[PDB]
Symmetry: D2
Subunit: 475 residues, 4 copies
């Protein structure tokens, strides 16, 4: 198992305090892993600065070929990557093999293409006697910080467009899930010039804090809590760094009377509880038309109680556990304070779902109003709340009444209603009659307190490039 930080032209154990990397399924320690010291952080950033000189001067083709080689290397080792991810996060092995790995390999391959495919206003004489052109150039050194929920995929989303933009990068995985990052580092070191990608480990309050405050770092990219993003903006303020923030979401699900309830329920069953609902796009805030409200709750309760987790065979598991005991207790806290109300009812689950490990029972919270904590605030667990609306209510207006703005869905067979909702929802993504589906050509990213910047799509690469106007006077 790879345990070495990638610092410039060499691999190197951390010299600071160890993180106790836990198996979330059993609670047992996977490994103790020392974090980067400040000296190592500086070294990594210095290497990045050194590599920038030559790496910012590569052609799109050269960088494309490098992204394709990272993709091969991952593919060639998809199995071990999948198993290591499964171990680190308690995800079901086939979900990782079948959903995550091909998505991850496709991401690197998608970026290899977008790198050769940036557009801009056409070159020409916009002032008489002067020829203008627009380039999209590297920005500088990127500090990249990843959450624990989709470690290897988060790494693809952060690194592919950063490197592909001609930038050099110092990358930090979550303290809980550094594993796939250290293995991918060993692989990248054999493909990329030294210092183009640097990988350090450690806590957000020490190592992450040092990276986001480092004077040489030009852009900070982060996915995590709203609170973490606010820290990033605060640090950014000190030296006017560019930022890229993906800050979570409570995705609204609007269900009209003419929805296919079977599709809706099966949709929420998987997409509302996938990855134990530790997903920023998780279907969790349900608005249900009054006519189908009771049927929805009923049918959803029984379909949710069949969700398999913690089974002795990782083939039959549909959802995994929560990342930590801390994460589980927080999910349990939001559920208790919901079960607090004499108008809210927990129809299924609500309790913790194991002795050893950090499992939580799939939960349906019903009767919840716009006022309630479970609706207004993010739960980040295998929990879903349901809220009634009527034909006299503007469910889009209700959905839009939020600090969040990442992802959303609308379920109805009526093209008129679905398209009206689609044009009015204040969310980075709106699915119609599905939820949760991503494709690497299409942008994922919040508005409002969910943040700004996109993962996947040409747009991410645009996020990591500087737009430059060149004007030549020739009269």
């Amino acid at each position: 198992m790879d345990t070495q930080l990638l610092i410039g032209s060499r691999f190197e154990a951390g010299t600071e305090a160890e993180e106790h990397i836990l198996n979330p399924r059993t609670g047992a320690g996977i490994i103790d892993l020392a974090e980067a010291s400040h000296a190592q952080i500086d070294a990594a950033v210095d290497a990045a600065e050194r590599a920038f000189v030559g790496w910012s001067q590569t052609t799109p083709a050269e960088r494309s070929n490098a992204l394709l080689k990272i993709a091969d290397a991952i593919e060639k080792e998809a199995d071990e990557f999948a198993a290591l991810e499964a171990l680190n996060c308690g995800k079901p092995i086939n979900a990782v093999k079948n959903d995550e790995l091909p998505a991850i390999i496709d991401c690197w391959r998608f970026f290899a293409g977008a790198v050769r495919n940036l557009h801009a206003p056409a070159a020409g004489e916009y002032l008489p006697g002067h020829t203008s052109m627009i380039r999209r150039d590297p920005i500088g050194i990127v500090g990249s910080i990843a959450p624990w929920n989709y470690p290897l995929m988060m790494m693809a989303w952060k690194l592919a467009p950063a490197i592909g933009g001609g930038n050099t990068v110092v990358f930090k995985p979550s303290e809980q899930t550094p594993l796939t990052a250290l293995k991918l580092a060993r692989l990248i070191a054999d493909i990329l010039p030294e210092g183009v990608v640097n990988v350090i480990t450690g806590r957000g309050e020490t190592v992450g804090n040092a990276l986001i405050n480092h004077p040489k770092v030009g852009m900070v990219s982060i996915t995590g809590d709203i609170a973490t993003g606010k820290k990033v903006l605060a640090a950014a303020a000190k030296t006017v760094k560019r930022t890229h923030l993906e800050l979570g979401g409570k995705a609204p699900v609007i269900v009209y009377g003419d929805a296919d309830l079977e599709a809706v329920v099966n949709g929420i069953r998987t997409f509302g509880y996938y990855n134990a609902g530790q997903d920023c796009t998780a279907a969790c805030r349900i608005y249900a038309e009054a006519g189908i409200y009771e049927k929805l709750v009923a049918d959803l309760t029984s379909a949710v109680s069949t969700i398999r987790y913690n089974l002795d065979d990782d083939t039959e598991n549909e959802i995994g556990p929560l990342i930590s005991r801390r994460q589980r207790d927080r999910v349990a806290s939001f559920v208790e304070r919901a079960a607090d109300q004499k108008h809210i009812e927990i129809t299924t689950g609500g309790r913790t779902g194991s002795d050893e490990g950090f499992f939580f029972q799939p939960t349906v919270v019903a009767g919840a109003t716009q006022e309630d904590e479970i609706v207004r605030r993010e739960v980040f667990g295998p929990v879903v709340s349901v809220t009634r609306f009527t034909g006299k209510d503007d469910a889009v207006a209700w959905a839009n009444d939020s600090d969040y703005g990442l992802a959303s869905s609308v379920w109805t067979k009526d093209i008129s209603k679905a398209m009206r909702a689609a044009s009015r929802l204040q969310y980075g993504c709106t699915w119609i009659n599905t939820h949760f589906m991503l494709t690497n050509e299409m942008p994922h990213g919040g508005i409002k307190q969910s943040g700004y910047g996109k993962d996947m799509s040409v747009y991410a690469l645009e996020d990591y490039t500087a737009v430059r106007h060149i004007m030549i006077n020739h009269g």
Copy 2:
């Protein structure tokens, strides 16, 4: 008389708080006293923007396009009046304003009326089997928008046109020293937009400005001004995760090689180092001159600069105006004096205040500045240019890049190869070759590093004020 009232939703009204003394900077004489917006007026402006957002975020590009064309028409119809007003408030030579500034302002509103109808995105299709995707660019919300004093009306064009054009609503604050043209445009705009789409409030950065950028309902803050002001805006944005658009000033390097057209270089810096009394984030101010031509350039530029006309009775004969305030003049005076204390630095011309009253400073050439001098490292924002010698053993691009600024730059040489190598490698939002300072409404202006991010002019300005949305329809 003059336009005095704030535009607050459907209401025109006077400020409630402390009066600012708006000064004629040529004379130091008072123009008018104008009261700041109260906290209640700020909140009311924002609430009006919130209400107007409902309908305005729902208009089509053609409708918005048509509004931008109308605003442009209104300004064009009153072009001489805007120009005189702006000349008065800033001390800009009347003809520079009439010929350079108004036509660029009008054309800006017209450019953006086009841009609104011409946003591109990845094409719609089935990227996943049985699912149709499309990409939209939607409004972001309410924009808090704050302008500097150096180009008040133009900066209002740059801040409002793309913001409104993206289907947003705006609360706009001009600099405390330069509200006059903003309150005039506000009158015309109220006759064109539905109420609350544009709201204009006056006041100091530390009072009115601070309250606006910290308003919970404002989702985007756009600021042109000081690096320190952008740092304050970012700190405010940290509280509710607002989007930000920051143009924070520059220190444009001008790389002059031995094979430049020296006459061109000199007439270049004479104009673009000193235009608007150097109160321009793209001023040609940090010169790197190759050893073979350093002394001739210093000698010729000094000669050229000392002929710059200012503070003449006949305003059509003036080339540059004064600095905006006593504070600004002193700051420039203090930078120059600290530079002259340096034994290796020679002030070859100017270097002192330039008038008995009002806020003129003499056009100044600072020779012999090095890469670690304050005058090379920090923005001065006065009619001041420094020159730094490099040799053929020195990488002048590397020197130019060794800066905290990233806004604008130029390279002078007849050699196409050196010119394209430098254009290729310069870490600046903009790089001119054998000119400086020329802008065009289709082309983006905006910085990197501590100059900030976001663009003004071009379709990129409009992209900054819209939200990219992915719509995916599962059909089977």
Copy 3:
């Protein structure tokens, strides 16, 4: 004065050949006789374009943009004179011209004024080490543009705005029947544009049109018209490898599923099958109605259509006008009578000529037609709609796609699934869902298969008229 002169470079000039008898198609009365261009005048026209191209191709996007706005302005100031003249020439009901056509025409010129400033391409950069590449879109050359009679002033807008906008010069020929608005506009254009950028000649397709499209100096031919004419343009392009832009014919299919809003469908078809007396290549003319609603759709459409007002003295009360000519009316009649003699076919309303004078035909509904019937295979170009039944077993999208035409199409269903599958699979340049006929100057219009290729409206029309150029500078 009613404008009658050809614009040839810097001269206005009467044609010197055979006169066309321009008719009032409401009454069949003569309006004026208009001489067509000689070969000499066509040569001078193309020569003037050649000469004007030198300078025009070197203008900036902003200069061309401003010229387009000035053209829009001129049309807007004379909107009513234009509408009155288009009504007189074409029989189009006056308020339809005033409220529908003119605003769209004016907005087309303005849309292109923006589009000229907003062309994109792949970004400049170093795609090979030490080489900077950039992409420009430059003028093509001299364009010969040929227009049909159905929408005379709008076709001129679609043909000229992007051609001129892209830096090209033009020789435009209106259809022989409808030259009047083109000649009025040529007079206004001459006061705005440099001589010879736009030239306007009159005459018949087989004399003047044939001469224009065969001219060796003409680099691109644009035609909107019959499939046979597009073929003739293609034959002519073959002699000198001219670029071509061909909009050639539409027989718009309308797929109505059993779950459509039937009231909306009926009201849609009442408006869109008959607008401009069905002289529209996007007319909703070939209807496919599912077994469940077929009968009711036929009854309700029959009834709705029988109320369409035309040929009333008060022109403000007319909903549709006459056909352009006696020939065109006689052509429509033949198609319909031949259809009626078919055993499985029923004419449920209309089917006769509709006036004692002029060239009206009764709005007609034709039920029980099949894929094999002439009325369904061939474009009729008159106020005639046909309804064909299909069952849940049939693939109506395949039926629709079983055509040589590929211009426009609509699908009517409240089911989002059915609507999206159809949208993705229809082999048509345009697909509406739950409407038909609605255009917008930002979105492209043009065919696939034998409907041709090239777009009108949108940035794509401007792209058709510019040449993509790769410029690569070796710098090491």
Copy 4:
């Protein structure tokens, strides 16, 4: 032992018509006899393409992107074999094919894998109130693709990668003299794509190509070849309104100013005027030299060119191969003979046949040619370059533009002003500055005027093979 079978849907078949004698152009010796497709195999290939279209047109961009990556990978795994076979068929020196062609071919396929996932269009949104528009780029149909003999495998990549990538199916015919690499590629492609997506037939232009281009189910024709062939393709297209994509050859002018690096110019022409024995449409063949450096250029070029190595027994030491055929060689020789007859022209070196066996021609410099000479007006497609003198009185760009061709061009000067002025006024799809011939897969290659239209390489190649579609949903 080589691949000899046509690919016709799910089957490999020997052609059944007359055999082509495929020759080694270095020796004149026979390589293999290879039968043409019959009319029935042609119809079969097209019908297989029609059937495969139903499924292939409905694949996602990712699916197609992966198909292109596997084709790229397969060629890469057999790079040396492909190289050897192309070197045998064309007599191209082995390391030119290995180091220049193969990497360009393989990268072309990877480039398009990327472009497929990266198409853009006007953004989706409500251009009319209550109507969501979006733009798609969908497949056009069945492509008939015809390739020339000069770059067989590369032309195949240029034709197939974007056509397949746009979701079309294809029937491809290589040049009758160069089928060998296409048949080898056919086996690899057939292990990767669904049957009938790509079909490969062989034969003469007059028989098989003619039958292919005139097939009524072919919706688009792409030809790279001679102007005459392009006119024939247009002739065919007139009969069913087929889309066309035409690269019809070049006569690349090279403008050399008095202040160019003459060493570079000489070295540029030595390589880029004679690469592939000048059987290349971008060959640096028409030189315009300033009066001050004309005599120097001619002298030094002559020197440089008489050292060009060819027909050595060690192929790694050969820099150019032979002409493809005797008819080609005799055409080149006949062009030179006629130039030599002109009294003001001097063949300074070469000008004769260059081998006893096979089809070598001597690298040739033709000095003193004017604008009026045949050798300047007409493409020669051999190892021949002509030089014309211009003075400072003359506008050399205008001279370059006085041409029926418009494919590629270069300008040589140290002066950035002169380079950029030229680059903006040259009427050529490509202009290089201070190099020639350099291509890159992201950048388009295609001509104007009689060089045709459409692009090879770049996203524009893909746009040429897709149909732009507007979908509009009335939601209210």
